[PDB]
Amino acid sequence: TTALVCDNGSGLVKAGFAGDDAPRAVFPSIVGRPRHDSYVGDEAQSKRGILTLKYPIEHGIITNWDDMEKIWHHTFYNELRVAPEEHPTLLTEAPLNPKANREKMTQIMFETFNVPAMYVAIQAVLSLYASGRTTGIVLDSGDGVTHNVPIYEGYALPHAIMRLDLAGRDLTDYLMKILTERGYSFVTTAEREIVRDIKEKLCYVALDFENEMATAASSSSLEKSYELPDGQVITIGNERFRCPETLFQPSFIGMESAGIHETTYNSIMKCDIDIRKDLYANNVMSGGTTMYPGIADRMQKEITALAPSTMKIKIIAPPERKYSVWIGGSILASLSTFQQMWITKQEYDEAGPSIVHRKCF
């Protein structure tokens, strides 16, 4: 009778119960199989030694359905320890998820896990809701994808969504590369996990990119120390802000794309004149890769440079924004008016999987 909320990301699954303010289970979105029997999440991780690890979700889209069933089987029976036939399930999807994927998702829930009711919601919409608004533009930068999504009264505007395949995992690889400028090798998937850790702990977004580079090459006060697992210590300086600077200048990594400040602006510009002003004042950050200190001040300054000079620009960057999608679905799944909007097994029996596209809002 409690609803389950499951948020499937490229990197992490966040799953739990509606009514909570945090996912009970967060675990790597991976399936592992013997190098020449399958393991999931945290499982797969303890034995990575003798497995090939596969990610079933790439850039926010489900591409391996057999593995995804195993992530879902693990989520219900091992992580949450519930019987799925007893619980309405809310699932999340990427903006612009293909219609065919969303139907396949519905079919699996109903025919393989026998849920009484499910729903599929766009991630960025749930994060807007978790901030208390129904109109806004969300910047959702996770592990695999970054999406700008303008939303008006609860409804995502498909023609103005921007997709940038440049996310947290790319920033980790770019940190690996530049650290092997001050002499370090990382290269293995294990050492990659170490650099991911450094990234999350030491990196930050510089208020002015150049001046910051001038500073780091004039005093040792930006260097920080970091202990590796083998005991050895490493020093990190200018790499701390150069790594995330990539989101503002993708040419750092050889991509020809606009940075996250320009896609935000361009997405606002694909909207009707009569709401632009509401979008400028309600930019919401969401996802793990928006956690860098300085990123929200940085965003404010860049978007004010591009927008008409009299526009009121406000960046909202809540402290819980790494889980905001999940918390959004926790709130939504608890509303009594949401209860009539679940897709029930009866509705699916009578109409089949394409029922899933009548969102009801």
Ligand X SMILES: C/C1=C/C(=O)O[C@@H]2C[C@@H](CC[C@H](C)/C=C\C=C/CC1)O[C@@](O)([C@@H]1CSC(=O)N1)C2
* Site of interaction with a copy of itself (CB under 8 A): 153, 155, 336-337, 340-341, 343, 347, 350-352, 354-355, 357-361
- Give the span between the Cα atoms of 132 and 140, in whole angstroms: 16
State yes or no: residue 259 binds ligand ATP (CB under 6 A): no
Q: Which of 321, 317, 325 is nearest to 300 (CA)?
A: 317
**Strand ranges in the chain using DSSP code E only, listed in sequence order:** 4-8, 12-17, 25-28, 31-34, 39-40, 51-54, 57-58, 61-62, 89-93, 117-122, 136-141, 146-152, 155-156, 162-164, 224-227, 233-236, 283-286, 315-316, 343-344
Does 9 help bind Mg ion (rule: CB under 5 A)? yes
Strands 57-58 vs 233-236: parallel, antiparallel or unpaired: unpaired
Residues from 234 through 273 that contact ligand X (CB under 6 A): none
CB of 274 to ligand ATP, least distance (A): 30
Q: Does 287 bind ligand ATP (CB under 6 A)?
A: yes
Residue 44 interacts with ligand ATP (CB under 6 A): yes or no = no
Beta bridge partners of 34: 51
Angle subtended at Cα 328 by Cα 326 and Cα 330, rounded to the nearest 5 degrees: 70
- Find the binder of ligand ATP among 106, 263, 264, 289 (CB under 6 A): 289
Which one of residues 30, 94, 205, 333 is an interface residue with ligand X (CB under 6 A)? Answer: 30
Calculate the alpha carbon distances from 140 to 46, 180, 186, 288, 299 in Å.
Answer: 30, 30, 28, 8, 13
**x/- site string to ligand ATP, residues 311 to 350, per CB under 6 A?**
-----------x----------------------------
Q: Does 9 bind ligand ATP (CB under 6 A)?
A: yes
Our finding on whether 94 is near ligand X (CB under 6 A) is no
DSSP codes of every residue in 83-152? -GGGS-EEEEE-TT--HHHHHHHHHIIIIIS--SEEEEEEHHHHHHHHTT-SSEEEEEE-SS-EEEEEEE
Q: How far is the CB of 170 from ligand ATP (least distance, A)?
A: 9
**Which entry of Mg ion, a copy of itself, ligand X, none binds 142, CB below 5 to 8 A by partner kind?**
Mg ion
Helix then strand count (H, E) for the chain reads 13, 19
**In whole angstroms, how close is the CB of 231 to Mg ion at the nearest point?**
28
Give the other-Cβ count within 10 Å of 346's Cβ.
10
Whether 361 contacts 155, CB under 8 Å: yes
Of residues 291 and 355, the one with the C-beta less far from ligand X:
291
Q: Exactly one of 2, 33, 38, 45 binds ligand X (CB under 6 A); which one?
A: 45
Show the site string, 150-189: x = touches ligand X by CB under 6 A, - = not: ------------------xx--x----------------x
CA distance 55 to 47: 16
For residue 344, the minimal CB distance to Mg ion (Å) is 27
Q: Among 43, 93, 140, 143, which residue interacts with ligand X (rule: CB under 6 A)? A: 143
287 makes contact, choosing from ligand ATP, ligand X, a copy of itself, none, with CB < 5 to 8 Å by partner type, with: ligand ATP
Burial class (CB in 10 A: 0-12, 13-18, 19+), 66: exposed
- Based on CB atoms, which residue is closest to ligand ATP, 7 or 262? 7
In the region spanning residues 129 to 148, those forming contacts with Mg ion, defined by CB under 5 A, are 142
The dihedral region occupied by 153, where left means phi > 0, alpha psi between -120 and 50, and beta the remainder, is left
Least distance (Å) from a copy of itself to the CB of residue 352?
7
Contacts with Mg ion, residue ranges (CB under 5 A): 9, 142
Contacts with ligand X, residue ranges (CB under 6 A): 11-12, 28, 30, 45, 48, 53, 143, 168-169, 172, 189, 192-193, 196
Contacts with ligand ATP, residue ranges (CB under 6 A): 9-12, 60, 142-145, 167-169, 196, 199-200, 287-289, 291-292, 322
